[model samples]
Target: TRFTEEYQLFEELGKGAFSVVRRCVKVLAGQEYAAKIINTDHQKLEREARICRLLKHPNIVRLHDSISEEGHHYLIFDLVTGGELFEDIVAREYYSEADASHCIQQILEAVLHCHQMGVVHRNLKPENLLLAGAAVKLADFGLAIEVEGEQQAWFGFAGTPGYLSPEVLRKDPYGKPVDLWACGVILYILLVGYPPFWDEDQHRLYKQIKAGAYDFPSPEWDTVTPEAKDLINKMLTINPSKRITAAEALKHPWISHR
Candidate 1:
């Protein structure tokens, strides 16, 4: 009811899987904000709101307000200029070879902050990685959850197919490491146009992920630094115990150099 009364909504900013983002500003202050209206199930919107409002990190998109009116859930967040990393990169004909490190660094920092708060963002696709200048911000926490107690694992399958970790493909209980695995896939994609693991069929893709089978082909990978490949290898390690963490990844030479 008061949602419209409190803020003036402007043009549609963008569209996500289940939400539409529009530019909005509070009546009290003319400051701009991106209001994400989730028209999907209320259950997921609530879950995402619970996590989004709690996250206070620079590399993450901050949630300023949550409004439930009619049947939709509206989330007011910090406004960002650049759009999705995929689109932004394509628009620029892709960033420099060194750009991958900084982008991955920001993602690792965001993931590290969430991991510190016990939240695991199971989804980190290119769509969720928003770009502003050279920095990338993490968004969309619908698949995120916090693991209680000492066990940091969540059962069942979640997140995109190609970015899924080997443990997840095997249906083994997993957690934060899966995010790192996705970062690996993302980092690989940022460097090369293709994903590390690829297949036309979902089942075939799952098989490749389960086997941890992927390689950097000659042309695309030739220009990518060895340090970059090393970081990807560590993050994509089959064993969750051996997978490089967000913090460890931030400390890697490739990340630290940038």
Candidate 2:
């Protein structure tokens, strides 16, 4: 029921609806880490922990260990200190053209890894992406659910409001493509500082997001690469069948070049 006294609490690094992460120094190990503590009552805590445990990626946070003490779960991850993309966006309107490309590549690589393992990151956003030494780690599994056998659709809202794809917004049965749409929105935000389409009205935004219609500046457009545009177009397609399949996306010119 007690955490090791060797680890000294430093400061609160982050928090979510059901968990809080604190910066700490592991005295015995002489290393720094973030302790993520979640209450047992949280429904998806175990599933999320399981996902983290099963996943091993250079771009994903390394879960050092997990402890269950007095009915509370504490998951420890290697600490990587850096500002978030959200802060970068707020401070600088958008990423430099090159940085945008790099960010998208990092994220897509992570998502591709997830999908290949039959894991779908239901929630992807600027806040969920953590920056650690020029790399972006895909995070926040509060909504990730495994797609097993033939049940690809989970009849429930799972992603953030502004990021859900059309089929997701309509609550139609959807699979990993929804995550692809979210990546599209994220790409738009990285380049424009906001999603390609936006409205205070949820229904309107949903319609626009579903349609995948928006303005692209002609003058400022030269900075964006054609391959990047093509990839975005493919990911944002409305028709699931017509949408960019993950297999196709992994081999797309933009992604494959790297």
Candidate 3:
């Protein structure tokens, strides 16, 4: 019944301030997985396990098992071998708006799944996304949390500046709509290969986000269509209350078009 007896842990894939993820193989089936070993409080890991177990969707990474030993908690997840979204984008020779649209569509579906369950993927960033062949998965549920209700919001800042919503910048209460804003940024990043508002000056960066000031310019902006632009435009709305919901954005022409 021990974790090490059932699954053998290999070299660590990566490590963070609170946890480390490593390659793990299940002896019973010889299936591979990513075992994230967390050194945090038992309840924190348990909360993550419960939330991950709560949401079941194709675009979200699967958490197959949870184990505890030596005061450490290990979360076993599907080990996706594909590279990050940005790296995959760069490797493609003939990437287009449609490709990005399809990618964004998968993320929106997963976000919709999260919101439907009263959960918010508060940590939507390029690093948190995974690409395995045709499937795009939303991973890293460490910051994702369930909120009080649909009509309410969770106050204070959550993620980095680039993907942050204006409501978060201004210290107003924010909710699932923040994820939509991050999704819009992801689409822009997919096409432009950079954050829409990029600046080494942190203060000005927040100012840009708070003001929603950004331009598509030329060249990279040329290939993207108006519908896609419009979708991003609606998503980056400064006011969270006015921002387009995931379901609404999912129905947009950019995402729905074949």
Candidate 4:
């Protein structure tokens, strides 16, 4: 409620299932920022805000502040101007392996930071990847979890279908590797412009994901580099334990070469 006097809300920036983000500015400083107003339960908002508040990385969106007013919770963050990574990727005049690698590098750095801090980003996808000029920032932590055990798992399905890891689809306990699997999915999409495990039937899709049934075939992948596919193979390993960690991913030839 007090934020109403300190900040002036402007046009809508984005909307999610649980929150609506708007462009806003500090009344006195006139400095712009993004304000996410959560229409969901206060407890849920607090849990999410806690995760975001603890994160500090160049490739991760910064949580400037949080406010609780009336029945709504607001999370303020740096205002990124370049919009979603999806838009930029889709609009690319000529997509290259280097371009994809650059994006994934930033994503891996952010996810690596989260993993090191005991946070698991349950949801990792293009929609949550925002661009600020040439830099890619990881945003949206609505499904993130702070791991309390060596390997943590949760019940019920969360995250986008195509990006979901095998352990998630199997209803088995999962952890950091889930996010790694998603990075593989993201990398695949970044190179080919489509997800690896996708089917019109959600059931069929889940089956493919659990089995890690995907390949780099056809004209879309003809131009892609071998090291790129190799990195994806390691990340998409069906067994979570075998999946590449963020630190390992950062050292992959594809990433290093870029």
Candidate 5:
């Protein structure tokens, strides 16, 4: 029932602003899990725990349990072995378009389930994507939330800058479209080995993103199909209302192939 004395916390797997993820083992079951210990006094991950419980998709990481001890809280999750998808993509000698498509399909499937349940993953970036062999698993839901309908907007600045939607940058009421914008950024990185928009200056970067001023340059863009680029254009559309939804994206020729 309680993990204070039940599980043995081992080496550090990762760390964040308000939490540290470590390898932990259940004493009785001897089953290993990722113990994400958070300083509840500083941050509340109870919302993330609740959201994880609502998700039961193959492409999404599983949350086994959540336990609290004093001012700290622990979230037990299934240990993902292959590490972040970002690392794997960069390490490859020749990353194929087909492989990128497959990864996006899994990501879309996971996000589709979340969207169907009215949950919006406000943060969807390469860092949040984990790999279990070749399968893509969406992780880190600290910024995720549930919406009342297809369009529920909020005026809060959350998520990484490069992956943020224009609506979010404007501090306007934004909803699920923010996630789609991040997906476009991810797809761009997968195909080109870099993000579409970046700057030594954060302001310039945000300005470029808001203006929708990015182009697939020579050499790299030489081989990628127009269909793929078309999908990216649709996703990266500056206007959230005109941006492609996950359902519409799934039907695109690049993903559907029919």
Candidate 6:
């Protein structure tokens, strides 16, 4: 079967493990859009679609419609001309401390909206962040799970390798703090072009994440503001219960620094 005649596919935008995104044009509106087509067998597409619908915020990609045709499920979202944040950051040779902080601030706002609705974004990598004008929109709720009633929601140990936090790595079943840890990693990557702690060996990476100690290289350290470093320390704390909450981090002076 073919996609219902609601829209016409334009060009391929991106492809990931479970889905392929394409630029498209809505038939009636004649407006550009992006369609994320997920092969159902890959994930709980229906549930994720519901979650995306519930997430309504300027900082999040707006969901236009959900469609199932030919046994394939499609999630339609507003088309963002600008690409992922990481692409721009890399092209600029990472980001200066101030610039990184600005990007993280916008992203944290979106994450706060998710937490408010009891949803946790299991994947919060730079690649999952999209750029729209000067704002950062959090996309890809495919890995998100509702944790409102779960006791150890943050302890599930599911996230991108470099962005996942300690409690998640330990399978502790925690709270919204896990997203903060991943945000810290995003901060590090934006400011330094790489994760503070990374290991080719999986076990070693887990150990390092568990330990939770980090350092900025001399060159990078010299440029990073002390306030920025302080926020990272609080965010990436090893203890889930002691980590910075999204609300607290957003209120931190460093995050609001102009």
List the pairs of residues colliding in candidate 5.
none
CA RMSD per model (angstroms): 1.9, 2.2, 1.9, 1.6, 1.6, 2.1
Q: Per-residue CA lDDT of candidate 4, range 37-110, in tens?
A: 88744565677889898899999999999998887788999999888887876787334887888889999999
Give the per-residue lDDT of model 2 (tens digit) for 42-85.
Answer: 55777888888877887677888777777567888888787566
* Better model by lDDT: candidate 3 vs candidate 5: 5
**Candidate 6 on 76-128: residue-level lDDT in tens?**
99887789987997789787666777788888899889998998887898888
- Rate residue 114 of model 1 by lDDT: 92
- In angstroms, how far off is 203's CA in candidate 1? 1.0
What is the model-wide C-alpha lDDT for candidate 1? 0.84
- Residues forming the 10-long window of minimal summed lDDT in candidate 1: 147-156
lDDT by residue (5-38, candidate 3, tens digit) is 7988888876767889899999899999989888
Error of 5 at 71 (Å): 2.0
- Weakest lDDT window of 10 consecutive positions for candidate 4: 147-156
Per-residue alpha-carbon lDDT of candidate 1 for residues 1-258, written as tens digits (9 for 90 to 100): 767779988999788678898998887887889999877446756878999988988899999989988866789998987888878656665556577777888889999999988888888888888877367889988788886633655457788887888887787888888899999888888886668888889899998898889898887678878888899899889988889989999889888874
Score each candidate by Cα lDDT.
0.84, 0.78, 0.82, 0.86, 0.86, 0.82
Worst 10 residues of 6 by lDDT: 148-157
lDDT of 6 at 64: 91
Model 5, range 97-166, lDDT digits (tens) per residue?
A: 8988888888988888888888898889878888882788999988887787766567378889889898
Shift of residue 113 alpha carbon in model 1, Å: 0.1
TM-score-wise, the better of 5 and 6 is 5
**Which window of ten consecutive residues has the lowest lDDT sum in model 5?**
38-47
TM-score of each: 0.93, 0.90, 0.93, 0.95, 0.95, 0.93
Off by over 4 Å in 3: 90-94
Provide the lDDT at 255 for model 6: 81
